[PDB]
Paper text:
In this work, we investigate the mechanism of activity of anti-[name] protein AcrIIC2Nme. This 123-residue protein was previously shown to inhibit the activity of [name] [name]-[name] in vivo and in vitro. We show that AcrIIC2Nme functions by inhibiting loading of the guide RNA molecule, thereby preventing formation of the active [name]-[name] surveillance complex. We found that it blocks [name] binding to sgRNA, thereby inhibiting biogenesis of the surveillance complex.
To better understand the precise mechanism by which AcrIIC2Nme inhibits [name] activity, we determined its crystal structure to a resolution of 2.5 Å using single-wavelength anomalous diffraction (SAD). The crystal structure of AcrIIC2Nme revealed a highly negatively charged surface that binds to the positively charged bridge helix. Mutation of this electronegative surface decreases the affinity of AcrIIC2Nme for [name], resulting in loss of anti-[name] activity. To determine if the interactions between AcrIIC2Nme and the bridge helix of Nme1Cas9 are required and sufficient for anti-[name] inhibitory activity, we mutated 19 residues distributed widely across the surface of AcrIIC2Nme. Circular dichroism spectroscopy of the three mutants with abrogated in vivo activity revealed spectra similar to the wild type protein, showing that the lack of activity was not due to a folding defect. We conclude that the negatively charged surface of AcrIIC2Nme and the positively charged Nme1Cas9 bridge helix comprise a critical interaction interface that is required for anti-[name] activity.
Numbering used by the authors:
A (entry chain A): 0 to 117
B (entry chain B): 1 to 117
Amino acid sequence: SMSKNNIFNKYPTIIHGEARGENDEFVVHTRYPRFLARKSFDDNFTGEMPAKPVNGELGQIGEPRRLAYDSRLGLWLSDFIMLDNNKPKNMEDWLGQLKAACDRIAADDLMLNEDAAD
Amino acid sequence: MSKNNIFNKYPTIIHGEARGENDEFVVHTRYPRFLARKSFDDNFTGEMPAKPVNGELGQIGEPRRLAYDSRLGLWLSDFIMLDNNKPKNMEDWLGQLKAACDRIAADDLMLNEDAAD
Ligand SMILES: [Mg+2]
């Protein structure tokens, strides 16, 4: 929806979520491609800002195979729900845009602890 | 329908924050599903209310937009409904939205308590 999308654009691009009773966290991406995702951490996760820029990978996990994002730094993005109803005209470009957004989300998450420290 | 079920995989109430904003956010993953902005009055205390949260829905600003006033300093605004269907009955839709907003406001009040305990 163009109307709905215009309302989405009045939101910050990356929203970090939490829920009572949950150790997993959450995310909302309000710019195209829009989605809601579960943000989870590996046991070894540090939360530290990395020297290199975030370069994750999109892939399939589990049985049945489901789309997941591996930040390669302990952060995972899962259970994606797309908030745009249009189907992407080109899939390869959609995967690239989704992966780039996930990399942005992971780096933004790493900024959370630093901000709290300062 | 199929997107609604993946919504069923999530907790009912999700509390959000964004870098650079003082306003907070909420995602309601049960019907009626939406994303909203959670804002606070200057004098908001966050101390648990003696009586149950009983907010009201109404219209604010010019042009008039739907907003929820918890009556305890918490506001929900800029509602983006995540269900595509239009409700058959509007006043029952408003009642369900209001009930979800009261639950969201009480859950937000519980956040501080949780951090203390
Ligand atoms: Mg497995």
